[PDB]
Amino acid sequence: NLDIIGKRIEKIKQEHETSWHYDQDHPYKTWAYHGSYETKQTASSMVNGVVRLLTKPWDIIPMVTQMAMTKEKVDTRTQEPKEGTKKLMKITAEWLWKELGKKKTPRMCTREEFTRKVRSNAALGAKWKSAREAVEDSGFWELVDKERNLHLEGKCETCVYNMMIWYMWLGARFLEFEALGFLNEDHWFSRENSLSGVEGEGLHKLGYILRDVSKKEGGAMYADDTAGWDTRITLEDLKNEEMVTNHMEGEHKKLAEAIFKLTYQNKVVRVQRPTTVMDIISRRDQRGSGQVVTYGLNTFTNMEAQLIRQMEGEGVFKSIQHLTVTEEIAVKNWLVRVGRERLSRMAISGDDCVVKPLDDRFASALTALNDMGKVRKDIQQWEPSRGWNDWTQVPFCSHHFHELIMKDGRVLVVPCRNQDELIGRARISQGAGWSLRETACLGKSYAQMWSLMYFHRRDLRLAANAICSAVPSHWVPTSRTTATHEWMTTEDMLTVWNRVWIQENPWMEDKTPVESWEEIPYLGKREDQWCGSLIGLTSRATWAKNIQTAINQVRSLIGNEEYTDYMPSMKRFR
Numbered sequence: 001n002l003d004i005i006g007k008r009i010e011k012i013k014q015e016h017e018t019s020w021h022y023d024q025d026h027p028y029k030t031w032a033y034h035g036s037y038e039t040k041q042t043a044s045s046m047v048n049g050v051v052r053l054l055t056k057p058w059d060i061i062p063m064v065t066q067m068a069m070t071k072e073k074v075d076t077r078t079q080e081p082k083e084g085t086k087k088l089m090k091i092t093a094e095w096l097w098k099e100l101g102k103k104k105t106p107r108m109c110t111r112e113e114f115t116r117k118v119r120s121n122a123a124l125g126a127k128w129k130s131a132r133e134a135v136e137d138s139g140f141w142e143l144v145d146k147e148r149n150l151h152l153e154g155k156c157e158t159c160v161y162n163m164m165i166w167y168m169w170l171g172a173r174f175l176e177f178e179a180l181g182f183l184n185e186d187h188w189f190s191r192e193n194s195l196s197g198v199e200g201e202g203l204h205k206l207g208y209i210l211r212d213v214s215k216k217e218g219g220a221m222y223a224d225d226t227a228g229w230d231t232r233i234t235l236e237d238l239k240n241e242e243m244v245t246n247h248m249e250g251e252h253k254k255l256a257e258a259i260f261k262l263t264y265q266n267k268v269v270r271v272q273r274p275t276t277v278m279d280i281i282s283r284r285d286q287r288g289s290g291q292v293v294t295y296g297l298n299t300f301t302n303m304e305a306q307l308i309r310q311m312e313g314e315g316v317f318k319s320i321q322h323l324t325v326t327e328e329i330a331v332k333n334w335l336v337r338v339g340r341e342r343l344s345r346m347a348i349s350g351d352d353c354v355v356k357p358l359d360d361r362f363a364s365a366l367t368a369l370n371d372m373g374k375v376r377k378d379i380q381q382w383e384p385s386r387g388w389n390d391w392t393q394v395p396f397c398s399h400h401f402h403e404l405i406m407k408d409g410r411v412l413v414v415p416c417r418n419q420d421e422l423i424g425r426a427r428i429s430q431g432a433g434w435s436l437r438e439t440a441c442l443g444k445s446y447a448q449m450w451s452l453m454y455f456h457r458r459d460l461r462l463a464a465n466a467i468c469s470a471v472p473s474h475w476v477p478t479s480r481t482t483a484t485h486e487w488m489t490t491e492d493m494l495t496v497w498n499r500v501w502i503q504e505n506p507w508m509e510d511k512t513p514v515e516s517w518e519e520i521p522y523l524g525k526r527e528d529q530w531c532g533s534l535i536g537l538t539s540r541a542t543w544a545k546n547i548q549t550a551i552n553q554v555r556s557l558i559g560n561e562e563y564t565d566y567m568p569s570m571k572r573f574r
């Protein structure tokens, strides 16, 4: 315990030797409080202006305006699972890893790969000012090289999480990425490799994936969201995930084993408390890993939980209190005989999941799931799961998927969500100190995503043409903080569409290109109203009629540049 974390604690305590104190009134129970030192400091979402000027009817929708404005979950403990549960998880984790690594090879990620990642402004939780300064400098990689040697010796000095999301100093992110980055970077959780997974599939393929699941014989499709899944990660899960190292070798295996046992399984965290003071607390369980590593581990553990719930549903094991030597061989024979087929009945994306089990016994297979700590959100603990009989209403990654027939007979499966949600997100700009040019480039990014993924929604196709028309044609799309983002490009969007939906799409057998935007269909007007369209309102009819005047107001605010008129792509203006 304190033989592992004590080293990190001493360093921070010594830096603030003139401000150290063990306060009497500390609110931590589940967290172990080690001490505190004095601090004083705090990101409030800002309005992307180009987007708001071109979506005026939504200035009065409070679903949209409210999004732009504006604890006791992390301070919770999970009961140690039963012995029978722990054995099932241990046996399944072991069999899963072996499957994931049949056609993979664990490997250390490089300083070159991590370097190019910070240059492209990748999303990472963090002497030097910017994230790019320490990478260019060499004295950093000495700080990294120091820790790296201490990790090989089985000790840790500077790998302390920051709670503001679990941030960490860039050096720790590198060492984390070096050992475990291979899971993301070499697509371990691809659908080709993992069967349940969807990493790097993109909003335009998920829909086709749910449908392919649907085509299998079985019961309802079950989409149960776990209540605060990161805070429901047990130490037994952290141990089951660490069994990946058993597929590694040499310097890699020891560097991985280190991260797991020194950072994940023994955490140290600095937390600001307004009463301002920085409290140094520790804990062994819960999730705080790298946002990208977390995804792959959450997908791993979630696959494991869902495979076990299917075994409970199919009556492979009777009771979780203790596992018999006949219940072991049966569970093991199950994984070997059908475990692959049962993975292909799922779509898992981190804490998210959609399962089409063999029958509806699954719905009331809640003993193992509740014991693993994977407690379902907003349903009684022992009340059975409400199934879905139609794949076009099943929720997945914040979306639902409409089947949609093109005028030449070919079948698009398009993603969709409440249009008040899409317009509200586009109107937000994360960060301060943005130029009119930068804000405008982010707007083009959303409009190009809308034209590619949400083209079938009338108000988005129109507002997309308007935004692209109000932004100089060459000005490149920019991202605030980084699956597949093909809308990030200056190429002609009808050409992107043809590549994405016709050329590259393996569910389309006829590869005849689409020649104009009119050949690309919309959802029914009621479907479009059901998913939140304003078609039929006077405001939207006025907005659409007088659309050029808004484009010209933005054109006037930016200045005299090279602008294109994209509105003639729609029939009404044509």
Ligand SMILES: N#Cc1ccc(Cn2cnc3ccccc32)cc1
Residues within 6 Å of the ligand: 458, 524, 525, 526, 527, 529, 535, 536, 537, 541
């Ligand atoms: N269900 C339904 C419904 C039927 C008609 C309208 C009127 N409306 C206004 N703008 C439109 C654009 C394209 C199509 C219709 C449009 C609204 C909703």
Ligand SMILES: [Cl-]
Residues within 6 Å of the ligand: 524, 525
């Ligand atoms: Cl219709």
Ligand SMILES: [Zn+2]
Residues within 6 Å of the ligand: 147, 151, 155, 156, 157, 158, 159, 262
């Ligand atoms: Zn360390």
Ligand SMILES: [Zn+2]
Residues within 6 Å of the ligand: 400, 402, 416, 417, 527, 531
């Ligand atoms: Zn919809």
